[PDB]
Amino acid sequence: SHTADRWRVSLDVNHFAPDELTVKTKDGVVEITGKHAARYISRCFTRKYTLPPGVDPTQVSSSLSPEGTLTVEAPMP
């Protein structure tokens, strides 16, 4: 009766070791992009997730734990 459903995904970003991360929510999709600056090779990753129907893109939040886990989440409609 009192459930506040949440969509959530987590990404282990430790191995990639991104110097920059971007979380971009658009057209029922969350797009996570990471870049690792060349210490000779530039490296980039992009990972996309389909959102449950009805999710408000302005309510998508994200954070990076000390242990290198990127969490992205949003309230369910």
From Swiss-Prot:
Q: Where in the cell is it found?
A: Cytoplasm; Nucleus; Cytoplasm, Cytoskeleton, Spindle
Q: Which residues carry this modification: N6-acetyllysine?
A: 35
Residues recorded with modification Phosphoserine: 10
Q: Where is the sHSP domain?
A: 2-77
Tissue distribution is: Detected in all tissues tested: skeletal muscle, heart, aorta, large intestine, small intestine, stomach, esophagus, bladder, adrenal gland, thyroid, pancreas, testis, adipose tissue, kidney, liver, spleen, cerebral cortex, blood serum and cerebrospinal fluid. Highest levels are found in the heart and in tissues composed of striated and smooth muscle.
Per UniProt, what does mutating residue 39 to W do? In HMND3; decreased homodimerization; increased client proteins binding; increased function in chaperone-mediated protein folding; alters CDK5-mediated phosphorylation of neurofilament proteins and indirectly impairs their anterograde axonal transport
Supply the induction statement: Up-regulated in response to environmental stresses such as heat shock. Up-regulated by estrogen stimulation. (Microbial infection) Up-regulated in response to enterovirus 71 (EV71) infection (at protein level).
Q: What is the effect of changing residue 43 to L?
A: In CMT2F and HMND3
Substituting residue 43 to W results in: In CMT2F; decreased homodimerization only with the wild-type protein; increased client proteins binding; increased function in chaperone-mediated protein folding
Query: At the top level of its lineage, which domain of life is listed?
Result: Eukaryota
Q: What is the effect of changing residue 48 to Q?
A: In HMND3; decreased thermal stability; changed protein structure; no effect on homooligomerization; changed heterooligomerization with HSPB6; slightly decreased function in chaperone-mediated protein folding
Annotated disease? Charcot-Marie-Tooth disease, axonal, type 2F: A dominant axonal form of Charcot-Marie-Tooth disease, a disorder of the peripheral nervous system, characterized by progressive weakness and atrophy, initially of the peroneal muscles and later of the distal muscles of the arms. Charcot-Marie-Tooth disease is classified in two main groups on the basis of electrophysiologic properties and histopathology: primary peripheral demyelinating neuropathies (designated CMT1 when they are dominantly inherited) and primary peripheral axonal neuropathies (CMT2).
Subunit organization: Homooligomer. Homodimer; becomes monomeric upon activation. Heterooligomer; with HSPB6. Associates with alpha- and beta-tubulin. Interacts with TGFB1I1. Interacts with CRYAB. Interacts with HSPB8. Interacts with HSPBAP1.
Say which family it is in.
Answer: Belongs to the small heat shock protein (HSP20) family.
Q: What is this protein called?
A: Heat shock protein beta-1
Part of the whole protein covered: 90 to 170 of 205
